Every structure is written in C-alpha cells, then in structure tokens.
Symmetry: C2
C-alpha cells in the first residue's frame, strides 16, 4: 500500500514586493538585492494569513485531483494563524471537509518533505485513504521591517498536493525517503516565541533571524547529500534524475546543489526569482511552476529535497504522475 | 507491521500552584476551584519551556523501554520553544540521538492521540523502527494572570511513550484509531498569535457540550473498530478536560468512573501531556492491568478529537 500523488494546486497572494520598492523603503539598491539573492519579486500576504492561502491552494489541488473529499488535511507551516489551535482544522472546515483528520506539522523549510512522510505514512498504514498536504508559510509577517537581507529573500505562498492510496508501481507513488535533523545547531535559523510581556502588551518584536553565511555552505551539502542517499536507496544514478525540486533557499544554492551531484542545472526546477523563498510552500510552488511551463515529464524520475531550521533536512523520490494543470 | 508501546515516562516541573495560593492571588476559594474544575493543584513551568520538560520526559521513557536510542522524536505541543523551528530536533539532539526524524505536531488537547497516529504510522510504514512521542505543554505561560477560570484549570507538564516496530498480536500494539475535527468551531478554544504591528481564552459553557459529545462519539467509533463494547474496557484514559466533563463522558458511555484514569486533582489540565501523565499516574498507583483493554481519547482546540484502542502492555516502573 503506497501513497500516490494525484493532484497539485497553489496560491500566491496578489501583492508583490519589487526590488525597487524594497530599495526605496530601506535606502538600498536594486543591484544589491539581485546580487545577494537573485530574487526579483516576492508575494506578500498582507491581511491574509497562512490559513487563507492554504484554503485557496487546497481547493485548486482538489479540483486537479478530481476529488471533492479527502480523509485528512495536514498543513506543513511555521506561521500558523494561531498559537492554539492548529490552522489545519479551520482550513479543512472551509474546504467543506469538516470531520477530517487535521493537524499542523512544524519542520521549517523541510516541512513539505516531512509532511509527505507523515501524510504518506498515514495513508500507507490505513489511517486515511486520501489526504491533502499543504505547504504554506507567510514569513513576511515575521520579518524585521528594517532587515534588507531577509526581506530581499523571503516571500509568502501556499502549495498543495492530494495523495491517495495506491500501488508502489504507479507513477506518483512515494518511493523512498531520507529524513533527519541536527538540533545541536538549532540556533542558526530562528523566529523566537513571543514573551509573556509581549503577550500582555499585545505587541511582539519576535523577528526571524538567520546566520546567512553559516546557512549557505551547509544548505548546499545537506540537500546534495540527502539527494544522494535517496538516489542510492531507489537505485538511480544522478544522471537518471529528470527533475530535482529543492527548497528554494536562495539563487546560488540551487545550482550549487546540482554542481555537487554533477547534475545539469537545467534539471533543477526553480521559480525563486518570481516568488522568493516561501519556506514550506517552496517545493510545491516550484512544482506548480514546472507544470505551468510543461517542464515536468509524465513518469520522469524526480527527487524533492529540503533543508531548514531545526536544523532539519530530507528528500523523497517519486516518478512524476500525469497531473491536470 | 504494528507500532507497539514499550516505554512510558513523564516530568512535572518542581513548582506547584496550590488552590490556596491561587485563591489568595485572585480572591476566590478552594471550594469554587474544586467544584468547577476538580483541580486541587497544578505544576508551573516558569523559566522552563516545553523543550526542557520534554527532554526529561523523553529520557525517562527511554529508560522505561531499556533503550538509549530511537529513530524519531515527535513533540505534540501548542507551546513550543520557538515559532520556528520545531522543538523536537533540539530534544532529539540533547538525547544523543542520531540524525533523528523530528518534528512538532499541533492538535491542542488532542495532540497525544494525533501524535500516536502520526508516529505509529511512520513506524508501520517503515520510515522509523522506533520512536519517542512526547505530549508536552506549558499553557501557564499563555494564561491571563487575572483569569480565574483558566488559571484554576491548566497546569504544565510532559509525558512520553516509546513506540517500536512489532506485530499486531503483541500487547501494546496500536489496534484502531478515530480522528476528526471541526474547524467551523475554531473560536471556542484559542491562544492568538501576537501582532508585530492575547492570552488563551475559552468559551467554557460551549466547550463542555462539545467535549462530552465528541469524546463520547469518538470512543464509540474506535470501540466498534477494535470490536469491543464499552463494558469490555479495563481503562479509559481521556484528555483531562475537567472532572465534570470526564464524569459526563463516563455516564454517556455507560462506564464506571472507577475505570476512567484521572489525576486532574494533582496536575490539572496539561493539554497534550494529559494522557501520558494520566498513564504515569495509573502505573504509579498500580491501577493499570497488564494486557488490559484500553482506549485513549482526546478532544480540544481546532476543534479536534480522536481515540486509539490498545491492550496495555507490561511496563516496569
């Protein structure tokens, strides 16, 4: 009993932050923003929360799958609408799926990969026959207004897939996983929790921070090595890969991952220039981009891979199924 | 391939807020608190976060299982140490684990039950051979200091089990599940995210009816799935919502309260930690029957609910 991908959907908020806007706001330049990140625009949730974005992505994903019900709704997010409860139950209800198994999973930029492991396993174990997994984050709400580095990189969005029970020989079946963590380096990427004083005031200044230099080099190796492990597990060489869909960490990181694997860079699916780094949403948003562009091959050998806060990392191998755009 | 419970552990913070202390601070009474909630004391985390409590609970559960290591750590919590990342990776690291599969799961007071489903399924599907599940919450950090209802009810703590790969015939095997939600009713139990430009609140009256009805129905559904009647249960171990809710669930299910495991008087309502802390209490008291028919059940914010059936295994304290 396998878990099979059978639907894809996504949603990006309407508002866009350009380099020109960001340069004007923070008294910097267009050059600096592109140079450092290669990101030219990022979508900004504004008054919308992760729940709102997830709802739109999930509805589109259900239409894609040709299904009007699923047994489970899981959100991979670090930017839930509340501290308590999870966002997933509300999203499930707003999809007309009251009664569904629903919860949020926290694994930062590796959330979508961990999400696939969790939902895929629920289906394989017989606790659900179908599921929505939504990778969604609204990191823009959590950025320091004065910080040009993070504001240049991060954007908001949601991407969703539908999984169903199936056979391991079907296109879209999740074939092998690599999953890990290194909590010894937990402090490298962080958005602190609100203090009790901040909760009392009704104002928090708990902003996302990252050690950019320390994150770059490690991110490349972490994802490259994780891909290699899953390639070895499924019996593929790097050359057998048609599609590599990494967490869109930064512009340089994506090509650097290909370099380590001696994989042609053109095989890396990337839209980081148009949407920025959307954390848990990055992989399914990149998938949606590939599908829009007709890049994704029916039955093509594919690996999805992530690395992020925790630290966390992981990869999943599958053959890409026929998905309705 | 089943997931089998093979260890139990817990940790309560040292500090205790007694009814007498709370009565003194908010000008109420032991009588009012005990009548309303059934709570007589509760443990308060203070400077310790959920990560600290989870580490201690986890270490105890490993020792209970006779293991130094497992493949995975999941924390069921709504009060993690950070907004990003999860707390589970740090816990796994400090336990000396090897690149653990690690994340936090959010399902409020149903978190332990959802956790067993997620962790159990990871094991059953072959993604892990062993795992720690920690139900941990420090709700005291999120309560309004002037709110007598929530401060009377909630306490802090962590409880953990070890699960391992095994056979469905083994004692401790997770036998059947029920899991659900109703997000249309999300506003009944809530801790808002704080704006960067908000304490926990509950609608107690509305929550009471839903807690009783959803926990009762969830148990009935899981009983049907495993093939037991309520009268076959040796133990029901519910989320410790409050004493009146547990009594109403027992009556609704035609269960004697004597078979409902509860330590809410001693630890209060600890959200995700409530079920494993109740199990720990039961084992301490010598109440738990070796191989006994057991259902764990939760309901909470989301709204969420769910139940798991298993035969309780021989765990040596």
């Amino acid at each position: 009993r396998a878990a099979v991908v059978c639907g894809l959907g996504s949603y990006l908020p309407e508002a866009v932050l350009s380099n020109d806007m960001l340069a004007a706001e923070l008294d910097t330049s267009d050059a600096w923003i592109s140079s450092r990140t290669g990101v030219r625009q990022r979508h900004i949730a504004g008054d919308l929360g992760s729940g709102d974005l997830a709802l739109r992505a999930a509805s589109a994903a259900l239409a894609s799958a040709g299904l009007e019900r699923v047994d489970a709704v899981v959100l991979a997010t670090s930017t839930g609408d509340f501290c308590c409860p999870a966002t997933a139950p509300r999203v499930a209800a707003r999809l007309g799926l009251v009664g569904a198994l629903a919860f949020d999973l926290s694994a930062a930029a590796t959330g979508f990969v961990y999400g696939l492991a969790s939902v895929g396993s629920l289906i394989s174990a017989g606790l659900a026959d179908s599921a929505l997994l939504v990778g969604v984050d609204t990191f823009s709400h959590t950025l320091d207004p004065a910080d040009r580095s993070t504001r240049a990189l991060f954007g908001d969005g949601a991407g969703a897939v539908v999984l169903r029970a199936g056979d391991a020989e079907e296109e879209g079946a999740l074939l092998a996983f690599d999953l890990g963590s290194d909590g010894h380096q937990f402090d490298l990427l962080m958005t602190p929790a609100v203090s009790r004083a901040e909760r009392s005031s009704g104002q928090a200044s708990n902003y996302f921070r990252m050690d950019g230099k320390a994150v770059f080099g490690q991110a490349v190796t972490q994802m490259s090595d994780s891909v290699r492990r899953v390639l070895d597990r499924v019996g593929w060489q790097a050359s057998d890969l048609h599609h590599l869909v990494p967490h869109q960490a930064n512009t340089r990181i994506l090509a650097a991952v290909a370099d380590q694997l001696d994989l042609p860079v053109e095989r890396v699916v990337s839209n980081i220039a148009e949407v920025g780094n959307t954390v848990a949403a990055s992989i399914p948003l990149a998938l949606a981009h590939g599908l829009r562009q007709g890049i994704l091959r029916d039955g093509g050998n594919m690996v999805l891979t992530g690395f992020g806060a925790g630290l966390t990392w992981g990869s999943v191998a599958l053959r890409w199924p026929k998905i309705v755009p």
